[PDB]
Amino acid sequence: GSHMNPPPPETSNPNKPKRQTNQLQYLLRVVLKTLWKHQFAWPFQQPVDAVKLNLPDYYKIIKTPMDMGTIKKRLENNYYWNAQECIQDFNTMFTNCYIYNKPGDDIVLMAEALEKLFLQKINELPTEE
Numbered sequence: 554g555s556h557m558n559p560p561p562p563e564t565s566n567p568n569k570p571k572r573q574t575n576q577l578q579y580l581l582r583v584v585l586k587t588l589w590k591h592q593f594a595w596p597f598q599q600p601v602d603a604v605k606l607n608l609p610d611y612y613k614i615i616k617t618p619m620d621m622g623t624i625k626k627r628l629e630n631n632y633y634w635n636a637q638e639c640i641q642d643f644n645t646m647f648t649n650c651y652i653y654n655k656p657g658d659d660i661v662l663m664a665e666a667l668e669k670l671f672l673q674k675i676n677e678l679p680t681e682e
């Protein structure tokens with residue numbers, strides 16, 4: 554894509570420690586699956602294209618971008634060490650939306666719907682086995 558968008562967050566790195574846990578499996582099979590198919594997921598399914606959206610300040614404001622396409626690939630590629638690393642990426646995605654956009658805005662209402670669902674599912678994250 555455009556040189557004015559940053560490289561997306563990495564989804565592979567042989568230097569990073571990785572493991573599968575039952576909590577990470579739940580984050581893929583239950584949490585990400587649930588959020589991904591929601592009516593309001595689409596703005597979150599890939600990195601923000603600030604060029605296409607005509608938002609040239611987006612990567613000046615948001616210095617820790619994150620999206621669910623990145624999270625999906627990180628889960629599928631077993632990139633994470635633990636559930637906390639994955640939960641933080643979801644938390645980062647939601648907070649970026651709330652920092653960059655205004656309380657009334659369509660994208661904020663969309664994020665809030667996804668976040669409500671996320672919280673329902675994380676409250677049920679299984680005991681680590």
Ligand SMILES: CNC(=O)[C@H](CCCCNC(C)=O)NC(C)=O
Nearest residue numbers: 596601606649650653654659660
């Ligand atoms: C051109 N503007 C849009 O398309 C809007 C606003 C997008 C803001 C950037 N994305 C995020 C996730 O913060 N997207 C809608 C309203 O769904």
